[PDB]
Structure 1
Amino acid sequence: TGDERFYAEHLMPTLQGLLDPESAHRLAVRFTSLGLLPRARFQDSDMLEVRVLGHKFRNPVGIAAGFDKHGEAVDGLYKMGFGFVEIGSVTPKPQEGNPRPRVFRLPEDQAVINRYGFNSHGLSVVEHRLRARQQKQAKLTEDGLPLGVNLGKNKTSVDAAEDYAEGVRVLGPLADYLVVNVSSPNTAGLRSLQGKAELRRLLTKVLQERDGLRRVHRPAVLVKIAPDLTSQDKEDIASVVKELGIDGLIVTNTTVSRPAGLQGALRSETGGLSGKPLRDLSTQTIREMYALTQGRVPIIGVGGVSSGQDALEKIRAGASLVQLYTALTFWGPPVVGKVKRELEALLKEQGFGGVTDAIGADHRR
């Protein structure tokens, strides 16, 4: 479209040039929360609907965690055309996160590096924010627009599992799904929660807390993993997920790797790398987890999606749904409709009746 070109070729390069990436993020959150967004001209077709996690999703393209950390822009994000919204990560207590600067744009790589460190308004603030629009959300959910909440842990916590359990109790009742994010690269020790008898201990506690919520307030629980896992870690996670009946996986978080070939001047900043360089690392991790789980565990695929092709690759690899984030700094909001339009076109071109028919299609080749 005309908006797609104007945003990618003019508005975003201008914004990028005037504002550092953190400031641009904050402005984006404000604009979105006010609905100051281009028209989402795209009308979701029936072919894009997916049923998974105990819900209808009008389209399979969601906003990944980290854009709306504190639940300030949820309605705006639906207005953008996302089929689902995930907020967070939210930590139990408020916390500032790392010192500034902590977000870096790598334009030559279509990538970003961030070390936010779980900056969060905390559970109580977010709880109240979601409660103010709880019924508005229940209507959205019923209409195929669900809400996920991603739960973190505070930097100085002495009991990680207890942080997550607090999150389940406070925000679980307000969410269609919860995410245990045990994959931020930017909280010391966090990704060690991805190992075995200990991941099983953590997840058992989170599920117990979830199962204690009243039925209408009982979310699905997903685990979000990194793209930097060993084969051993992957196998272990798949094992535990099956054993405990975790509802789904989010694959992947950002990478602590630095693929060969990055050009940006800021490539050696500490933090998680997102965007194009993560893309195929993420697709491959979807592929592997789909096979380890025998296609029985729904996957939300995320990392470097900026086109329909990138979305379809993840779906065919085993994702039921996809998310994006970093593409917005390069393309802006029009990327959402672009992705959806392109995905629909490809699905038709490859002889799929809808998204659902494409899920895991590469494993049946």
Structure 2
Amino acid sequence: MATGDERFYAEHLMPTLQGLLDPESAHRLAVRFTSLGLLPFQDSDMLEVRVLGHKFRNPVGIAAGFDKHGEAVDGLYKMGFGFVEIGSVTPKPQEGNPRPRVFRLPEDQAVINRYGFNSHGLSVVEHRLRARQQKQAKLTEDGLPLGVNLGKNKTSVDAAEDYAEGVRVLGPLADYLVVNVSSPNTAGLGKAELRRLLTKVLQERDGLRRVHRPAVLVKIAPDLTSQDKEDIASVVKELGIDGLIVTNTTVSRPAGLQGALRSETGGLSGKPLRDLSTQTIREMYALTQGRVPIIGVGGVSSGQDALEKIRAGASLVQLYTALTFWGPPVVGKVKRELEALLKEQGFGGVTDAIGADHRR
């Protein structure tokens, strides 16, 4: 419990917790324990990455959706993540979907969720981040940046204005902001319309004072058509979007899922998403000519999984579902395995491996 023993968590503690608790209850408990620092690897120079205007001490981040309301940021750095992304946060508070809304697929090492952007709202999260704003400035300077993922309310009549409000309220507190094209669990969340939305978002970001001006990334689904991907790549290049987060959960249900709950509505995460996500990274890296930083996300639970996404074009990776199965020790596991594989494959560090598959 205190050592951080990978086997004890993976074989005993986490499975026991999952047998006692429904997944939303376990999620809530995890956020509470993490926020108190009740947690069980030394980052080497090989893992440092410079992207998005920032130093990242290691390339392994916690994906959006774990700390939706910015309650456990410091605990997540204590867990060993190189960067933390909170959210999604919506402008007004909203409850999200009725419970149950989170479903485990243990036989698939996967989860399906339909949280529906449950959020404390911008004002609450703003005041929470302001309470530790200088602590975060020091963490960022130390190579531990903070991302904020912005969502839209269910009953909003103007999606672009919801995102613009997010930029104005939490932009000044973030190293990067994220706008999803891609929750599966809201509404209808042409190319001119993404262009319209992102133009407004970037105008709002550009209007912030320079020390308070975050990078802006777009987070995309794994379920896009070839046309959608080409169009996104074009708009990102046209507008100078700073980066992409690839990918959110999938609304597909790959052949072979075994879990009893496989036909629940929602986004699927974890192992069944992994290679769909890696392939989407590969495609977006090629379409953007390797000039647009990608954060690769979807089914990362080992160093091999991380390095496959880096070699496909990711500069940084995130994980979430692996934490739910294997617990806090998975972060150091991924970092240790990634360092070993980098050495084994002749890379001087992470930076040298970014996009390496495209050069072979």
TM over 0.5: yes
- Report how far residue 329 of structure 1 moved: 1.2
Provide the rounded CA distance (Å) in 1 between the counterparts of 2:16 and 2:348. Answer: 40
Provide the rounded CA distance (Å) in 1 between the counterparts of 2:269 and 2:253. Answer: 10
Provide the rounded CA distance (Å) in 2 between the counterparts of 1:29 and 1:104. Answer: 18
The size of the alignment, in residue pairs, is: 357
Provide the rounded CA distance (Å) in 1 between the counterparts of 2:99 and 2:139. Answer: 36
Question: Cα deviations across residues 243-296 of structure 1 (Å, max 9, x unaligned)?
Answer: 000000000000000000000000000000000000000000000000000000
Residue 9 (structure 2) pairs with residue 7 (structure 1) = yes
Provide runs of 4+ in structure 1 moved above 3 Å. none
Question: Cα deviations across residues 79-104 of structure 1 (Å, max 9, x unaligned)?
Answer: 00000000000000000000000000
Give the corresponding residue for 1:133. Answer: 132
Q: Secondary structure at the match of 1:2?
A: coil
Provide the rounded CA distance (Å) in 1 between the counterparts of 2:276 and 2:4. Answer: 32
Residue 38 (structure 2) pairs with residue 36 (structure 1) = yes
Q: Is the 8 A contact 2:4 2:328 kept in 1?
A: no
Q: Secondary structure at the match of 1:156?
A: coil
Q: Is the 8 A contact 2:4 2:329 kept in 1?
A: no
- Report how far residue 181 of structure 1 moved: 1.3
Provide the rounded CA distance (Å) in 1 between the counterparts of 2:214 and 2:175. Answer: 5
Question: Cα deviations across residues 211-241 of structure 1 (Å, max 9, x unaligned)?
Answer: 0000000000000000000000000000000
Provide the rounded CA distance (Å) in 1 between the counterparts of 2:80 and 2:325. Answer: 17
Residue 224 (structure 2) pairs with residue 224 (structure 1) = no
What TM-score results when the alignment is normalised by the length of structure 2? 0.99
Which of 287, 293, 298 is the aligned partner of 2:293? 298
Provide the rounded CA distance (Å) in 2 between the counterparts of 1:303 and 1:232. Answer: 22
Q: Secondary structure at the match of 1:12?
A: helix
Which of 16, 19, 32 is the aligned partner of 2:18? 16
- Report how far residue 2 of structure 1 moved: 6.9
* Structure 1 residue ranges without an equivalent (≥5): 190-194
- Report how far residue 182 of structure 1 moved: 1.9
Q: Secondary structure at the match of 1:104?
A: strand
- Report how far residue 135 of structure 1 moved: 0.1
Question: Cα deviations across residues 24-66 of structure 1 (Å, max 9, x unaligned)?
Answer: 000000000000000xxx0000000000000000000000000
What TM-score results when the alignment is normalised by the length of structure 1? 0.97
Provide the rounded CA distance (Å) in 2 between the counterparts of 1:244 and 1:20. Answer: 43
- Report how far residue 302 of structure 1 moved: 0.1
Give the corresponding residue for 2:50. Answer: 51
Residue 278 (structure 2) pairs with residue 279 (structure 1) = no
Question: Cα deviations across residues 135-175 of structure 1 (Å, max 9, x unaligned)?
Answer: 00000000000000000000000000000000000000000
Provide the rounded CA distance (Å) in 2 between the counterparts of 1:171 and 1:150. Answer: 9
Q: Secondary structure at the match of 2:216?
A: strand
Give the corresponding residue for 1:180. Answer: 179
Provide the rounded CA distance (Å) in 2 between the counterparts of 1:293 and 1:182. Answer: 17
Question: Cα deviations across residues 92-125 of structure 1 (Å, max 9, x unaligned)?
Answer: 0000000000000000000000000000000000
Provide the rounded CA distance (Å) in 1 between the counterparts of 2:107 and 2:131. Answer: 42
Q: Secondary structure at the match of 1:187?
A: coil
Provide the rounded CA distance (Å) in 1 between the counterparts of 2:134 and 2:242. Answer: 25
Q: Secondary structure at the match of 2:126?
A: helix
Provide the rounded CA distance (Å) in 1 between the counterparts of 2:295 and 2:324. Answer: 21
Provide the rounded CA distance (Å) in 2 between the counterparts of 1:358 and 1:105. Answer: 33
- Report how far residue 208 of structure 1 moved: 0.1
Give the corresponding residue for 1:122. Answer: 121
Q: Secondary structure at the match of 1:66?
A: coil
Query: What pairs with 1:1-365 in structure 2 (closer than 5 Å)?
Result: 3-38=5-40, 42-189=41-188, 195-365=190-360
